[PDB]
Structure 1
Amino acid sequence: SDPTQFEERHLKFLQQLGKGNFGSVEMCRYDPLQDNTGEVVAVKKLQHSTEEHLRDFEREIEILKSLQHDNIVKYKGVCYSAGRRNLKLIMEYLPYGSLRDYLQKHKERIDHIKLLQYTSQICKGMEYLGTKRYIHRDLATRNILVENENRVKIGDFGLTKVLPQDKEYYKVKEPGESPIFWYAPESLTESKFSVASDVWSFGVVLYELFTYIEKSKSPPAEFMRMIGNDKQGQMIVFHLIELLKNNGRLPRPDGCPDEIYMIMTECWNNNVNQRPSFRDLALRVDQIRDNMA
Structure 2
Amino acid sequence: QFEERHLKFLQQLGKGNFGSVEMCRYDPLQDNTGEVVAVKKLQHSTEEHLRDFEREIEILKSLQHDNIVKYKGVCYRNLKLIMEYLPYGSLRDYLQKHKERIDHIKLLQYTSQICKGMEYLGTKRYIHRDLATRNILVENENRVKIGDFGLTKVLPQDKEYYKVPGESPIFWYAPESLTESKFSVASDVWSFGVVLYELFTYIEKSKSPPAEFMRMIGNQGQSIVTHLIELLKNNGRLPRPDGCPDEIYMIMTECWNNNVNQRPSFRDLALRVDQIRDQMA
| TM-score interval, smaller chain | over 0.9
Gaps of 5+ in 1: none
Q: Helix, strand or coil: the match of 1:265? A: helix
Shift in Å at residue 35 of structure 1? Answer: 1.4
Compared CA separation, residues 91 and 234, structure 1 to 2 (3 A): farther
Q: Helix, strand or coil: the match of 1:270? A: coil
Shift in Å at residue 74 of structure 1? Answer: 0.2
Q: Could you give the per-residue CA deviations for residues 241-286 of structure 1, whole angstroms, max 9, x where no partner exists?
A: 0000010011000111111011001100001100000000001111
Gaps of 5+ in 2: none
Contact 1:127 1:279 in 2 (8 A): yes
Q: Could you give the per-residue CA deviations for residues 6-28 of structure 1, whole angstroms, max 9, x where no partner exists?
A: 00111111000111011000000
Identity %: 99
Contact 1:98 1:144 in 2 (8 A): yes
Give me the TM-score of the superposition, normalised by structure 2: 0.98
Shift in Å at residue 233 of structure 1? Answer: 10
Q: Helix, strand or coil: the match of 1:49? A: coil
Over the aligned positions, Cα root-mean-square deviation in angstroms equals: 1.1
More divergent stretch after superposition (266-275 vs 175-184): 175-184
Shift in Å at residue 177 of structure 1? Answer: 3.2
Compared CA separation, residues 276 and 21, structure 1 to 2 (3 A): same
| Partner Cα separation in structure 2 for residue 134 and residue 228 of structure 1 | 36
Shift in Å at residue 142 of structure 1? Answer: 0.3
1:104 and 2:100 are equivalent in the alignment: no
Compared CA separation, residues 204 and 9, structure 1 to 2 (3 A): same
Q: Could you give the per-residue CA deviations for residues 192-233 of structure 1, whole angstroms, max 9, x where no partner exists?
A: 00000000000000000000000111111111111124xx99
Contact 1:75 1:90 in 2 (8 A): yes
| Partner Cα separation in structure 2 for residue 16 and residue 27 of structure 1 | 6
Contact 1:54 1:86 in 2 (8 A): no
Structure 1 segments of 4+ aligned residues over 3 angstroms from their partners: none
| Partner Cα separation in structure 1 for residue 222 and residue 208 of structure 2 | 20
Q: Which residue of 2 aligns with 1:39?
A: 35
Shift in Å at residue 106 of structure 1? Answer: 0.4
Q: Could you give the per-residue CA deviations for residues 152-199 of structure 1, whole angstroms, max 9, x where no partner exists?
A: 000000000010000000001xx1131100000000000000000000
Q: Helix, strand or coil: the match of 1:108? A: helix
Shift in Å at residue 62 of structure 1? Answer: 0.2
Give me the TM-score of the superposition, normalised by structure 1: 0.94
Q: Helix, strand or coil: the match of 2:100? A: coil
